[PDB]
Amino acid sequence: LSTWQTFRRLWPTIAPFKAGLIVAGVALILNAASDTFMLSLLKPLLDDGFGKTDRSVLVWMPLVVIGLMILRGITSYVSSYCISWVSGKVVMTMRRRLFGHMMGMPVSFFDKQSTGTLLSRITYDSEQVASSSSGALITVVREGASIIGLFIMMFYYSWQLSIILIVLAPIVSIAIRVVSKRFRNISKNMQNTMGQVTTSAEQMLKGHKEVLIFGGQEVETKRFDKVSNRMRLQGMKMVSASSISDPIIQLIASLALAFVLYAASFPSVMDSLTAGTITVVFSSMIALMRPLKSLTNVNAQFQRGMAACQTLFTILDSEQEKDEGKRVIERATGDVEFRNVTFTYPGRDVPALRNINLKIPAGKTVALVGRSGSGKSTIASLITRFYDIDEGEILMDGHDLREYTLASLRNQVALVSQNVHLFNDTVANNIAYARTEQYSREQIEEAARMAYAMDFINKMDNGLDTVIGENGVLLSGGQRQRIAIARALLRDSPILILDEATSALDTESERAIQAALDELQKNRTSLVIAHRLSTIEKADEIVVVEDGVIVERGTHNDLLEHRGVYAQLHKMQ
Amino acid sequence: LSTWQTFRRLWPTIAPFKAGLIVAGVALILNAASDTFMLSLLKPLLDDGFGKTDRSVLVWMPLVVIGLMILRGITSYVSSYCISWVSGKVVMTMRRRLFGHMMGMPVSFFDKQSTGTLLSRITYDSEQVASSSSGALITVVREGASIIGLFIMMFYYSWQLSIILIVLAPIVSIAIRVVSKRFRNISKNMQNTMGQVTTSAEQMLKGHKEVLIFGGQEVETKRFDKVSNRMRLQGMKMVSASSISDPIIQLIASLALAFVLYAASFPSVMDSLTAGTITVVFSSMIALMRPLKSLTNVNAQFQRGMAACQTLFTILDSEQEKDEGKRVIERATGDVEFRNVTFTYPGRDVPALRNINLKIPAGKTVALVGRSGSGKSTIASLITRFYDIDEGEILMDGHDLREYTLASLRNQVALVSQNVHLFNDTVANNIAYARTEQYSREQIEEAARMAYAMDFINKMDNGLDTVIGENGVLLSGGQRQRIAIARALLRDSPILILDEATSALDTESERAIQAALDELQKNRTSLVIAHRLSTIEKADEIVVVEDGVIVERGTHNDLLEHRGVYAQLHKMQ
């Protein structure tokens, strides 16, 4: 199939490191030739060694054995290390490409499955692919070289008994196969019948409810007696089938061996045959069995690994973010407006946003009121263009976002929330993340102090250079709120979205973040996903979206006079 | 431990068939002696055979091989068949005892575990126990006899190189173990560190939502670059560790072999050493490895099987139905009375029935109305005594049922419902089930005809002798209603419990079952779990039980005048 073409597809990666593969191949060939020579070592030990007197063969053969193990160990280590080096480099390159492509695919991808299996894809799948390919190569080369060496050793050493074996070993195998298959079929038949009787016993048990109420407990025992007798008979037949199977293979193999001996008995091949020369020949037919099985399984292993590589490449090539816009926006000082916006969340046939009309005035803040799942976060998601709207237009400065570059637009929006991501880095490199080459330490410290986020930083191990993260020094919810506020204030994002916390923190923590938000952070065009009524009451406009449709719009007092859904919810609050 | 005492507890079962075990043991010993002799066959083949000329050794040795393998096949078949016979008989006896005890446990037990796992207990567990014990015996005897034979062969054949081996081999095994363990420890350490770096990558993936909105996608790539480099280095170290463990083991074994050869080199043991006598000695140390591993695994396999036997015996001995009553009731012609009856269904903390009071007049029927889960079937269950009441008294003829024998009491109750159990037997042996020695065929046919259940019986293959069941000729719901009605009418049970169907069948089937029920069946003290308002309207008393309490008592018209819950349900119906 095309599984062997997967090697050609991977070749542009493995080929640059060909030396690390040539060394491994040479080492494996040397290993095979160090094992074949060991097998050939037997004949001098018997014919010219142990026989007659110890004519220095017995004092020199162990030295050869020791040297040959030294060679085998060295070559095995060299081959394994080189194979590991090339596999590690291939895995590293493939992981790099996969990740670089992976952090450019639309958020939707990461919603289809959780991040847990993505780490599996980028960690275990590449290791599996490289391990399977390396195993295929290290098996084919080594076992093929060993088989060739063993066959050469056979033919050189009294080929008369070798040419027989190669014409006799297969046919016996075929015969063996036949017998096994036949008897296997018999077993299958019995299994089917067994199932029936088993079901009968099961029915018996379900009769309990109806055997106690009548005068049972005796006829039931007799019927189970019959069923158990039948079960025992069937088990006996199965065991008899297996135990008449096995000795047939044994006898066929031993008959083959007897025929080999009888053929060697004739006075035509004995002349080139001695006591020691056989011990290398028959031992070859003993050591040859395993390489053949490895060669048979090498194709299955290769196919499995390289078919995993199929999905690993399928993830590698796909569609990415449609950054088909071309205009570049700096310092958005216009109006964010929703006009007949209809959107269906991926995975949800029922639309989540329907003809949503919403204007966010410049310099003013709006509070978006609604229940959980009402669609009051999908609006922000569309603002950041994590999902493209199905119908309508959303515009800032007067132009729809699908005609804007994704880098420029997203640089205009900064979100602060209770669930913010902290990269494993210094606190300063997290305040000015991705823009550390544009802002100085003084600006970072100014932002941190102005966002009321210095007291918890000046008390750290290294202050603003502490390595922070979730796999390191872990910060509290208020602390990460403050750090995100410092980041957003430093970046000076014209577009602001806010997800207010659903729970109140400590008095010191709440006092600070509240001061930051109100006095310092919120001075721009803000869209607040409000949860506290105090925040709602201090907003220039209130919008109450309801499961896809906004019901009422206005100020807090105006909506209270309206006596709508907002008034009822505020009464609840 | 006591796992070896499990054999003593099972001995009263296996011991009666000792001959089937003695034959198996003798056959296994003969198999071991046919393998040891086959190994000892090598020396004449090399020394006195293949060497010099073929002095009739080469034409007689294959005959010995053929005869020995014929003996091996015969003895293997005999041993396996005898072991299978004794195992099958033990399994049959244990299954019989288990089932006979199992049909005596109160319904409760059968509610704790579904009927699926009970069939597993009575089918697969006993086979597992017998298979494990038989494997333990067939391994210990055979492999121990083989080991003894091989050691005798070693000591007889040039003991000088045998006494060495049984000294060097063990110490080499210890040394090998040491090395492996040490390097294994190293691997473990790396794994821990590996985990950390893996989590880092996973963290980075979860940063997707926070990297697109800022000017990332570059520093992220650099961080993954560093992480991937560290991952590759750690994988390299792991492979290096494993690839430095294999060669050392190999080298240690080869050094042991070289020391053996050097020791044999000295002119003190060579005199008894010949070319052919050595192949038999070293081949023994090759064939001896597998029996040792089998002996090591014997105890583990035995413990596993005989610990499964522990739970199989735990089920065998337990509590049964409390048939502590001694008085016998015939033809119950009194009243069924519930007085302050409070009962908690097993597995439910909240009580199922609470101070339930109820009178079932002699010769009259009562319709007990309620919703699903209201406890409208637990009352019938208590009447049948599938469960014992926690407090209160339920009595027929004037005496509580815990003062009555369970056989006599349950002969006074016959339940007809839509879900009735049909045993795999003749239709007549189901009409007069468990009482086929008391009623003739004429009575069975009379009951079947009188219950309007003959038209569907006269049209079967053999009429009233058809083998019916759910694993055979399957009957319809109305047909099984009719067959249960015929059974109850034949038994002439004074007390009736009727569970009316929740759905209407065909017009012919409904007409027959309804006629049977009303005209013929219901002429006794009846407790009806009514579902249709028509059946309720022709009842002498209506009871509405819900949530362990009775809403109202009275007749249909009286309850309608009461304007209670029954009136509302009748309006609903």
Author numbering:
A (entry chain A), B (entry chain B): 7 to 579
What text does the study give?
The ATP-binding cassette (ABC) transporter, MsbA, plays a pivotal role in lipopolysaccharide (LPS) biogenesis by facilitating the transport of the LPS precursor lipooligosaccharide (LOS) from the cytoplasmic to the periplasmic leaflet of the inner membrane. MsbA forms a homodimer and exhibits a topology similar to other ABC transporters, comprising two NBDs and two transmembrane domains (TMDs) containing 12 transmembrane helices. Upon binding ATP, MsbA undergoes dimerization of the NBDs, inducing rearrangement in the TMDs. An ATP hydrolysis-driven conformational change promotes the transition to an outward-facing (OF) conformation, facilitating the flipping of LOS to the periplasmic side of the inner membrane for further modifications.
MsbA (78 µM) solubilized in C10E5 was prepared in the presence of 2.5-fold molar excess of KDL (194 µM) and incubated in the presence of 1 mM ATP and Mg2+. Four of the structures, ranging from 3.6 to 3.9 Å resolution, adopt open, inward-facing conformations (OIF) that vary in their degree of openness. a–d MsbA can adopt open, inward-facing conformations that are dynamic and vary in their degree of openness.
